[PDB]
């Protein structure tokens, strides 16, 4: 009817127009935003990646952009802004073809055929570095650090990343290594110098007082039980109606607990970690101070992350009430360390844990809350770049330079393909050339001239050279330290091809009532 | 009151049904367009849909003609299998051609009887075109693979489709007719397998077993009961009052812990070491059961239990005070296995016969649910093929053939319904045009040539419109059973007619 | 407020009347069409019978409501004719308007319309005059039933419904009683059945079943203890309630209520019973004593519902447990739970091989709409058949009768000297409204259909030849067996004139507007 | 479509009805005079239906048929000019009803002629013969018609004179038709109504000749339609002036010419010549005229084109428009030609006795004052028109509007017996009839619907009973007071009316 024609044209207009605004990426371009919200709050933003994940929209076509960034982070952890901008290119293709009289189902098909050919050509130009070899990993990690904010804490960070991923690794080029095994914890105190890689499992938690086990031998505690004591879960016949009577009930309650924590220690506990959700109050607030005395660690109202990691890696299973004695299904352990460092920080390290041959943890340290943040982003990207090699190896051009390069090789393959699909893909080759162009355009004034020029300089270099996108100048782009993993650009194409395709597929208005 | 007058009622009836119609028509047939449903009015989300059930129910009806059709078609999907897309699209296509009739000025009863006699002609021609392919039972297996293959595709599944063809065919075949949610019980969980599904031998239950209750039971004898304590049992010496002041709030809570121990001794009397209760308790009550040595397995399913009961001769039924009231089921070991990366308590001892349990593994919950509904419609079509092992070639090839036969009779037989018999025939052919342009073939050209060919006796060749080409349907396998199509046709004609009959809508 | 008089009064009356008339005419006869209507409750109600349409709508102006009342009396007396009476009424008001603009006062219209309808009742009296015994009636009756069942849509495998109805009017009724028996008739519908199974229940059905399956599924002839006694909580109108606390009062109460329930079972069984029907039913506790002193019982019977079961069976009352005797016990032939054709329909029958003074007509259908439709087909069908059992005078519907009458009225119209003559002839066109409106339903042009029927009434002067009313390509009303009671049509014609005569008479209207409900 | 003629036709009907409404209140002797404003700003007082339509009509296509319809009435009967409009508009009221019902226009047009054919039967049976060769019978029927007409004051004296003219033109028993193509209305200044007389020959207008002879017996009727002089130059004469010499040169030609013409006429033998004007003949010479008179030939110069065509048929004095065509055949035979200067001042040529085909009578109507002459001219016209109607159609029917109810009642009953789809058309047509006697009764003064209900009932029982009576204003027999109309005057009203209604229905 008229419902399918008008929806496709507007939804494509509406994502694409926002994608035009958004395309100011790489380097210093556009003008800052101080943002008066639709709820009246002052918000300040910088960085393309951080914005896209945060972005709060209600236009169904634009929501695709938000979530596209998140999938990219999970597979690559690189190219999070990149994947959105190139998706906006595919949208640019879709309008011009509707006018030509190529039907929407056909334009979907062509995206697959664009993907299949494109990624194969990415693998062709790529120089295949080894994913278990440290030297090439070390160069690649520098590339990602030096493109982020750091340029002097980069020195410390490159080698820690090659070591961290080495612990989790699996020899193959198949999909392995994750940030479900790479555990990332923050700690106030230490410095970027003192950041520590523990090959086992270390959990981030807060431990009461300072004066507790920092030595070897531990039985790691995963409990799901509340105490039995007077006015807890055991009978008392003393009913209070006075401050004095209140005092008695609490005294006998805390007293029995001082006995109880000895049976907890008999086990070998030097670590106990309490469940997230109570069954009354859990171990009482009195119990925690008594436990501290036995030399046994605490955390009530534990985060979600810890519960998942403990059970998986160390094989740690729930245990019976203490009056009934612990069931002993707890895993192996040998370290209960409360990490203090430059006067601050509370942490649990578990060393001599059982493992499935995975799971590393990096501790992220900084003497000030902003200084931790500065280590944290930079390391995240450096871990992830080496990661991408195990999942699928090799190095291609970085900054999104092979999507510009890919355009030349790809036009040729469309013409000789000589399908219905050829025209859709050829038109996408020309759209991938707009990405350094569009980026610059919005910032200033005088748009047209520079825009045409950047496409000439990259194209003419041929199938092996063009303009760099992290230094400028026509020079070899395939190895020169302007590289990124094969995984980053193939992943980006893949994700884009799926999300965009979906806009074409709908017909007629739809709105659940 | 509100009175919507004679022309206007019929106009609301046509546009409303057309709009809902165009949602399920994209997914229908071979691969063409899909629906991605846009949710903003309930909640703000996007949804990936391919099943007609999801599309039609989730969007309300606020157009009175539209209500009737979505209800008739949803029930047809359960019984018949693939009645959601099929019934709604044809009913919508017929109203379009009513619109034409009425402006011209043909009375609604001419239209109603023309469509109806024409449905009787279509049905007679579908019987003609349908021929057996289940005359050896191994040949029957193959016939069922084709039918199954067709349903499964053009519904988004990653690699769960490939298993399901073989799965559904096995399940139906051995049982003979009937339902098949009893011959294959669908347990859905996430695993480390991205989109794989397998046949379990035993029933396996999700939930970790912790505490002093042991993870390995040896020599299980299972006492089946469908009720039990939610987390606390009330009884003769269970009823008390212990709360009336603010400190007395903790004392009653103490007391409730005690009530948990009272339920344990109830089972202890029986001497049946495996007690199943259908509801979950907490981790703290579990210590009491495990201590005594009559183990409680909580969060049990009715479907799983039913699987064991059939092979062992047990009974699924409540009431327990002795184990002589409710017959026992058996397994050897109930051993904690890890499948995927999620820890499961797995009952093993008996395998197959009257029921299997099928365990699906994904990583999204959406994939499991989607998979079940695809599969479901399939199992229903295959249920009907046991009774009538005729099969008739489709993809849109069937729908043109019946339409050719209805056009021939449309000229000869009637005294005034000619125009209407033809309109019925053209509406069946609307479905093969829409899919042609998604495919990259010319709609007009497709419907006008092969239609004469297949009718003359080339029933094999039919519409392959996932490539826009003429292909053999005996070799490519775009063939569905006789039964499923006969009933959705019946349904769709009735549904359109019901709302076509309506010349005034009163709203009070 | 405004004073509406004359033209203002009569203009308003056509505007209101027509709206109702248009729905009815497009749902008229066995070629009739379903009307699917939505309420503002989000619900949908699928209607076709003229009475349900009048209940549904609350359109503006008094005139709508006056048609509503009229149809209700007639559902009990005739049955069907609900669509027919209203469409004929609007025809009178359209014609009256044609004559009103010519310059004819409404009192002229009023007397001449009343006088014309007397011409028509005389014409309709000619067609039959037979009154025949009950057995002989049974074949004509079943043919009439098809038609009536057909005008609520579908009649295929509805031949059970017709044959149970002949039994149903005979039992409750006499032949020359001349009174109504539809307050002796209980219509019952339950979802999950079939429209292909229709059963005649010579007693009564309670939707309740036995307390246990372990208790016997048969009970002897008679010996029914009718009771108002609790074996569960009776929900007292007393006031402040108090609950047990602790283990000891809990136990005391339980043993007390158990002890009292056993004593009660014994006194019932001693005065002679084997069925307890108790107002306030049975609890889980109460089940234990009742199996143990072995006496089938129904758990729960409604407050008024207990009276209805007593009169029907003819059984002799026992109000309460305080009133137990062996000289007063209710009637039965057997008490057994019945599965009709499915286990989705479970009703428990107290059926009679003794005195029956009511008949329960149990019709089933698989879904809510299907039972609705089936109950209304069957009740109206039953009523038309009660007029015919008494006096088996039959006329063939489909508008054939009306055409003949239109010829008779049109001639007699002009042979009077008074100023009514013009009204009387408009009356003749107004009778023709009904095969005209049938035609709209058939799929045929309104005009040529009436005049085909008319030539055939010039020949005979009797309806038994006409046009299509089932649709089968016959020009017969006696090879189609389209049959309505003689009193019934005569009733639609006389009632409609009587009503519309009040409406022409009243031209004195105090409304602020033009219509108020 | 035929939607747009449907919309045009209703608009045309409504305009035609509105113009026709004025005439329903102008109907009969009791009619209401209409004060009519021209596009010229003059008030015209008329009670004659026909001239109201003619003098100004609206610009719609049905309005035009009405002028045409009454124009046709005048030639055919000369009577019922008012009544004929009444039935036309009344029929168009009936048609809207049929149309809405779904009786197509083609049906209503054939049914409307079929109903005329059916109407005429019923009428005739009522009618009753009178003699057509007897003077007295035709006079009584004419006298009754005159009281009903607008003019009546001198019509007593003009009625026996109107019959006398007509009796001579009736020679066989069939009584021919009698048109006005044989009865000539000539007026003369001066004289009374008693002085009026029927001249056997023809009376011609004016009389130019005082040098001629004034009484010549045994005269030969000669006809000039050729010149008497050589052609125009710039005057009707060949002679013109612009120099003394210039006139001389034309005179040489003229002189020769005038002698040969005047002499040529005399040689063939003529003693009456009929000469036209000097603007209807291209040359005539005063010189040629002086000689032409002085040869002793009786001359009338100056006469109309209409007169010249009239004479040529009636007295058989055929065209002579050239010299070549004066031969004996063309000439008449007159018995006498005579100047009369009595019975009204001024001189006219009487030819008394003429050899004539058919028979041609002329009535010199006359009166004292200019307005007396005009009243009697109207009066003979009215009187003669009714006589001619009765000699064509021998039987006699009643006036008063009673026949009009009597046809209708029969036509309703018969239609129902016959039946058919066209039944509705013939029944509504009969009811169209009921308007005209009703409209008449209102003008006579008595409540109109009540009058026409009662006369219907008198016709139903008795038949030949009551009618609208001018004394009573109402319901009293017209058998006690003869109100007669000729049979053709009523046949004309109906058949012409139907034809007009037929064209409009057929008209897109």
UniProtKB/Swiss-Prot annotation, chain B:
Quote the catalytic activity from the record.
Answer: ATP + H2O = ADP + phosphate + H(+)
Q: What is this protein called?
A: T-complex protein 1 subunit beta
Q: Where, per UniProt, does this protein localize?
A: Cytoplasm
Q: Note one Pfam family from the annotation.
A: Cpn60_TCP1
Looking at its record, which EC class is this enzyme? hydrolase
* Species in which this protein is naturally found: Homo sapiens
Q: Which GO terms describe its molecular function?
A: ATP binding; ATP hydrolysis activity; ATP-dependent protein folding chaperone; protein folding chaperone; ubiquitin protein ligase binding; unfolded protein binding
Q: What is its EC number?
A: 3.6.1.-
Name the source's superkingdom: Eukaryota
Modified sites of kind Phosphothreonine:
246
- Tell me yes or no: is Signal among this UniProt entry's keywords: no
Q: Which gene encodes it?
A: CCT2
Going by the UniProt record, its keywords in alphabetical order are: Acetylation, ATP-binding, Chaperone, Cytoplasm, Hydrolase, Isopeptide bond, Nucleotide-binding, Phosphoprotein, Ubl conjugation
Task: Output a single Gene Ontology CC term carried by this record.
Answer: extracellular region
Q: List residues, modification Phosphoserine.
A: 45, 245
Quaternary assembly: Component of the chaperonin-containing T-complex (TRiC), a hexadecamer composed of two identical back-to-back stacked rings enclosing a protein folding chamber. Each ring is made up of eight different subunits: TCP1/CCT1, CCT2, CCT3, CCT4, CCT5, CCT6A/CCT6, CCT7, CCT8. Interacts with PACRG. Interacts with FLCN. Interacts with DLEC1. Interacts with SVEP1.
| One GO-annotated biological process of the protein | protein folding
Q: Which residues carry this modification: N6-acetyllysine?
A: 139, 166
UniProt-annotated binding residues for ATP? 29, 83-85, 480, 485
Curated annotation (Swiss-Prot), chain C:
Main localization category: cytoplasm
Residues engaged in binding Mg(2+)? 80
Q: EC top class, in one word?
A: hydrolase
Using the record's annotations, give every residue carrying the modification Phosphoserine: 2, 322, 515
The answer to keyword Cell cycle applying to this record is no
Q: Which domain of life is it from?
A: Eukaryota
Q: Which Gene Ontology molecular-function terms are recorded? A: ATP binding; ATP hydrolysis activity; ATP-dependent protein folding chaperone; beta-tubulin binding; G-protein beta-subunit binding; mRNA 3'-UTR binding; mRNA 5'-UTR binding; protein folding chaperone
- Stimuli inducing this protein: Down-regulated in response to enterovirus 71 (EV71) infection (at protein level).
* Family stated for the protein in its record: Belongs to the TCP-1 chaperonin family.
Q: What is this protein called?
A: T-complex protein 1 subunit epsilon
Q: Which gene encodes it?
A: CCT5
From Swiss-Prot, chain D:
Residues with PTM Phosphoserine: 11, 159, 177, 419
Q: Pfam families, alphabetically?
A: Cpn60_TCP1
Class of this enzyme = hydrolase
- Residue positions binding ADP: 28, 80-83, 147-149, 400, 485
Which positions in this protein are listed as binding ATP? 28, 80-81, 149
Instruction: Give the function comment from the record.
Output: Component of the chaperonin-containing T-complex (TRiC), a molecular chaperone complex that assists the folding of actin, tubulin and other proteins upon ATP hydrolysis. The TRiC complex mediates the folding of WRAP53/TCAB1, thereby regulating telomere maintenance. As part of the TRiC complex may play a role in the assembly of BBSome, a complex involved in ciliogenesis regulating transports vesicles to the cilia.
PANTHER family in UniProt: CHAPERONIN (PTHR11353)
Family under the similarity heading: Belongs to the TCP-1 chaperonin family.
Official protein name in the record: T-complex protein 1 subunit delta
What gene is this protein translated from? CCT4
